[PDB]
Paper text:
Amongst the Arabidopsis MSL channels, MSL10 is enigmatic in that it has two separable functional modalities, regulated cell death signaling conferred by its N-terminal soluble ‘death’ domain and force-activated ion channel activity imparted by its C-terminal portion. When heterologously expressed in Xenopus oocytes, MSL10 is indeed activated by membrane stretch and displays a preference for anions. In Arabidopsis, MSL10 is primarily expressed in the shoot apex, root tips, and vascular tissues, playing a critical role in adaptation to hypo-osmotic shock and induction of programmed cell death. Analogous to DmMSL10/FLYC1, each subunit of the heptameric AtMSL10 channel is composed of a transmembrane domain (TMD) with six membrane-spanning helices (TM1-TM6) and a characteristic C-terminal cytoplasmic domain (CTD) shared by all MscS homologs.
Therefore, we asked whether AtMSL10 embedded in a lipid environment, without applied tension, renders a closed conformation. The most pronounced differences come from the outer TM helices, which undergo slight rotation and outward movement from the central pore, in comparison with the structure of AtMSL10 in detergents. Interestingly, the CLD between TM4 and TM5 was completely disordered in the lipid environment, further indicating structural flexibility of this peripheral domain. Remarkably, no discernible densities corresponding to lipids bound to the channel were observed, though the channel was fully embedded in lipids. Therefore, the structures of AtMSL10 in detergent and lipid environments both represent an open, conductive state, further indicating that the wild-type AtMSL10 channel, unlike other MS channels, uniquely favors an open conformation.
Residue numbers in the entry:
A (entry chain A): 248 to 312, 507 to 731
B (entry chain B): 507 to 731
Write the structure that this text describes.
């Protein structure tokens, strides 16, 4: 449609120019009318050209990538309108020399104020379209808080906290910060923490490892076979600090399933450490009476 | 390679714009007021777009000139260990140890220090333990000898060079110790690192248990009424 409109406009402009080229206005007044008509044809051809290139830009951006697209389309259409009207006026050239310079200096003063905000606006566009870190419906982390996404506007993005609290971020601020995406991530790993006494024999630790491996093998639905049990520093030679590393069959996008499976794993570890006769105790204290 | 292709596309776009504009200048069809109007439009354009080109260009310099890491290696930023898979002009993508995927800006990373594990040599690890102030010197010497012997018996995982250091005494009751040793690997091999550290900790525990070394709290005296 745009190509056909541009072709028709160009054909009309060429026909008008050729008719006005072979025959030129005789009366001085007719010359001004002919010049105005030629300027109008040129301005219409131009405006169609800007519209066509703007449409091509919008379509390529959409292909690379909806509310944000519509807002961007409206903004660029406004820019197209202002530029085409101003260059039409320049073709008219009705302003005096002092008036044209006055408009130019008004543009200079305008630029500072509005471009100052256009800095944030343009960097937000680049963040949304070029970086494209997340999409509507996925779960993301910013500053360690887990949130969801529903909206995408040019200046702001809207999120829901785990308690469904609705938040409205600026897009420029997010451009400066790191962001994690759960929907785009692969299957994950979770760690459950526990501590045991320094007196625990090595054989008990080996039995605990064997039981943990067996249990994780019996549940392929929730956990990957690969796992690891690691030891952490010893406190006062009384406490051993332990951690179990395991991988879900899901991401953290499935929050409720994540928490329920973690709870089940914790209960299993508790049953283990209770039925293996593993106990933790405080350091003994000696007392002198008087 | 992705960064190279993106840069090629960007520079081709710049080439296209410059060649077309200088072709138009050769044509010289615009009026004097029109040429000046286009020049001032360029002036106004420059501020807005060059403001972002600042970040873009510093990111290019960071990626290509500095070149601190490559795809597949493990790096540290702000103390968190992560992996790398992607390299884009504006952003880099990493995986946390829990496989969480993150999308950094490249300009922000340019301002920050970065550590690379794949480019580093064989490393050192430290295991912490404390013992009582009453421990005799001979017991400490025996512990050092046993630690040296054990590290010698395992050349596969540990370098012969090591050191046992003492740290400040707390209330003249607690001695704080630390053992320094070097792996035969880097921290890029995370699972092997953790497993070997766990084995070393278990060995140290067996030592301190079979050498009859005990730690105790300070005694307390009480007056009854």
């Amino acid at each position: 449609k745009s190509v056909q409109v541009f072709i028709w406009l160009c054909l009309i402009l060429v026909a008008w120019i050729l008719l006005f080229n072979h025959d030129v206005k005789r009366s001085p007044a007719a010359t001004k009318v002919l010049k105005c008509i030629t300027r109008t044809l040129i301005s219409i051809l131009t405006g169609a050209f800007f519209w066509l290139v703007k449409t091509l830009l919008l379509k390529i951006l959409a292909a690379n990538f909806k509310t944000a697209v519509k807002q961007l389309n409206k903004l660029v259409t406004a820019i197209l309108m202002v530029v085409t009207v101003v260059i039409w006026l320049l073709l008219l050239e009705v302003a005096t020399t002092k008036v044209l310079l006055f408009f130019s200096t008004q543009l200079v003063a305008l630029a500072f104020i509005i471009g100052s905000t256009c800095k944030n606006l343009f960097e937000s566009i680049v963040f949304v379209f070029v970086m494209h870190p997340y999409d509507v419906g996925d779960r993301c982390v910013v500053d360690g808080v887990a949130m969801l996404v529903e909206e995408m506007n040019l200046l702001t993005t809207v999120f829901l906290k785990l308690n469904n609290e609705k938040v409205y971020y600026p897009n420029a601020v997010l451009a400066t910060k790191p962001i994690s995406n759960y929907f785009r991530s692969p299957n994950m790993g979770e760690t459950v923490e526990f501590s045991i006494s320094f007196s625990t024999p090595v054989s008990k630790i080996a039995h605990l490892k064997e039981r943990i491996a067996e249990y994780l093998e019996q549940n392929p639905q929730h956990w990957a076979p690969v796992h690891s049990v690691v030891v952490k520093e010893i406190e006062n030679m009384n406490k051993l600090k332990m951690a179990l590393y395991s991988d879900h069959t899901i991401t953290f996008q499935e929050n409720r399933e994540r928490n329920l499976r973690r709870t089940e794993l914790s209960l299993a570890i508790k049953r283990m450490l209770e039925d293996l006769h593993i106990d933790y105790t405080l350091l003994p204290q000696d007392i002198n009476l008087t």
